[model samples]
Target: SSTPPRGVTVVNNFDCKRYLGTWYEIARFDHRAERGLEKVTATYSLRDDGGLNVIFKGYNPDRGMWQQYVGKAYFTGAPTRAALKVAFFGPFYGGYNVIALDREYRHALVCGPDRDYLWINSRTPTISDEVKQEMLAVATREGFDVSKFIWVQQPGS
Candidate 1:
């Protein structure tokens, strides 16, 4: 059994392979870098080094262009669990904890450092109302300030 860090709970048996792929950014906690970005999405791939090659992409409508950010993620706890850390700048890692996920791996909720970062990720841009409600319920139960959640835009409606 994996004993996660205090205040951070993750999926009991996370499968990284199942998690690898593109995910639409349904909602997130705002940050300077993510601010003003639109049509956001994230892609995850497994690296030979047993880590995740993470790419976060978003469109800047005002700039008329796409912004791409690449980072690396590694398991902070057991690989079977979903606790991780990511670094956009080398050596300075940030929390990337997966607090909730669907059994089919089609949806996920990730929490970040200090309640300042959170992401509701889905396999497709079109998340059903039912799913959103369920996710919100969980987030609320976790003490997250859902009122601060910014709904992210995605391409192709």
Candidate 2:
């Protein structure tokens, strides 16, 4: 039998403070809507309710401006941490499940409820090429459109 595509692996409760900072986008199973973007980064902060304040940024060379989007995330499994639902709009939400995470919380594999959405994020502006390939392989095995991945260019890359 063929293996089923893997979904995000949720991590246990993590320190919001420790997780807060700039995270570069390494690779992503592209959403048709997001095309021609590079130098992507997602920053997180602690909200008053102990949830997370999320901000996504991408540099649009054509537009010559930095794209910034603000959103919020709430833990679904537990108040501490597990999986989360995120929303850029109020009242509406989408899955922001964390499938895999590094021990130091420096890198993570994030996914939505389905295979259409996936992202690899790192604390630094760039990640090792080996790590990038590994992440892409995982996304492909999970039934995502690995070919559509928009390999983000970091500041140095």
Candidate 3:
């Protein structure tokens, strides 16, 4: 299998209705975007241009504060629902591509600019072991260092 960098295979238009609400972060690669954070959850909402209003939340131990960031995401192309670009500020942006997504939109494997930027998200706080293994395979195949992933702790777990 070949690694597809800066390109993602689109699944379908992510339904804002079903996508809204809390999604727990299972694992991710360390990056400045979310450094020194745990118990991460991303909430999505409907935006004006049929895009999504993305709000990311996390716990910062260093500052003993809760982190929240509001951003906007837009479809990358006309064909697939996989590729998306997100921006925390006007004009400046970052990639939030969906490399793998479940059919029902319950779980997803997302990546940013490179192997150092990745996240596994799910509608629930935890995903099945089978799904976790599958996701790990996908990330590893894409040339990410699976061993370095930080498994985010859920609220209770």
Candidate 4:
């Protein structure tokens, strides 16, 4: 069976309530759904059944329209941990693990089932250089290819 990459770890004592709200996509690895998109953002809200409602919005240049994807996310185990699974389609979930998070919950590093999927999210459209460096260091330590990261374009940034 396949396992997480070496050094990969989820955030400790993660509070989902603090993680609620809209987060801007600062950078990410090229992926099918998010490819060719700009000004990407993900909004999270609490669901009635203790799950998370996720709304992803991005501008697609090809279609010249904003695309939105709705999904559900639930903690894989403990709600206090940042390891969770998200599904856009019925019964098909994908890993959504928060590997690193700042104390203020301003910036975070997220990974999928493996190292191939990686993303940097910020509380605002742009993140401070220092915080960005810190997150990149953690990603590099976890064996992610930092060079392959595609910086996302946001309205303000």
RMSD of each: 3.3, 4.7, 4.0, 2.6
- Computed on alpha carbons, the lDDT of every model, listed in order, comes to 0.79, 0.70, 0.73, 0.83
Per-residue lDDT over 1-157 for candidate 1, one digit per residue giving the tens place of the 0 to 100 score = 1223357567879989999999988898887788888878788999998899888888878979888888888897779978777763421237677899988999998887656567898999879889999998988877788898888877655
Question: Which lDDT tens digits does candidate 4 get at residues 103-133?
Answer: 8988889887777788999989998888889
Full-model lDDT, candidate 2: 0.70
Task: List runs of model 4 lying over 4 Å from the truth.
Answer: 1-6, 88-93
The TM-score of predicted model 3 comes to 0.82
Q: What is the lDDT of residue 59 in candidate 1?
A: 84
Descending-lDDT candidate ranking: 4, 1, 3, 2
lDDT at 64 for candidate 4? 97
List clash counts for every candidate, in order: 0, 2, 0, 0
- For model 4, the local distance difference test gives 0.83
TM-score of 4: 0.91
Model 2 bad stretches (over 4 Å): 1-8, 88-93, 140-145
Judging by TM-score against the true structure, name the best candidate. 4
lDDT, candidate 4, at 15: 91
Worst 10-residue lDDT window for candidate 3 reads 1-10
Residue-level lDDT for 48 in candidate 2: 88
Better of 3 and 4 by lDDT: 4
Task: Compare candidates 1 and 3 on lDDT and give the better one.
Answer: 1
Q: Any idea what lDDT model 3 has?
A: 0.73
